[PDB]
TrEMBL record:
The keyword Nucleotide-binding does not apply. The keyword Hydrolase applies. One of its GO terms (molecular function) is hydrolase activity. Belongs to the pancreatic ribonuclease family. Residues 2-103 form the Ribonuclease A-domain domain. GO terms for biological process: defense response to Gram-positive bacterium. The chain holds residues 24 to 128 of 128 of the full protein. Keywords: Endonuclease, Hydrolase, Nuclease, Signal. Disulfide bonds join C20-C69, C31-C76, C49-C91, C88-C105. This is RC-RNase2 ribonuclease.
Length: 106
């Protein structure tokens, strides 16, 4: 949302088999149509954004696990997809805070 911490809770997860319906229904999202959750550690991701302090765009060199929820059929009936691919994020203050895109950064 604004800092790497808030961006962590909404775009990162601890369990690879997260529950889209049980997590999205939470007030944090409020049954959001779709969301892109990642599967990694805070120290493994911090080292990826511990190269720049100013605002810049960084693209992961290696592929990371990606658990995303997508609106397949309203209301809160969503699906979970797991795929390892690179991601484009905005680095700031030695930490990432925004999700730009995947292999292609618009």
């Amino acid at each position: 949302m604004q800092n790497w911490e808030t961006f962590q809770k909404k775009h990162l997860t601890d369990t690879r088999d997260v529950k889209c319906d049980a997590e999205m229904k939470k007030a944090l999202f409020d049954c959001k149509q779709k969301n892109t959750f990642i599967y990694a550690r805070p120290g493994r991701v911090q080292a990826l954004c511990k190269n720049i302090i100013v605002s810049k765009n960084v693209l992961s060199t290696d592929e990371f696990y990606l658990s995303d929820c997508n609106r397949i059929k309203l209301p809160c009936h969503y699906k979970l997809k797991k795929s390892s691919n690179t991601i484009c994020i905005t680095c700031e203050n030695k930490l990432p805070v925004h999700f730009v895109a995947v292999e292609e950064c618009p």
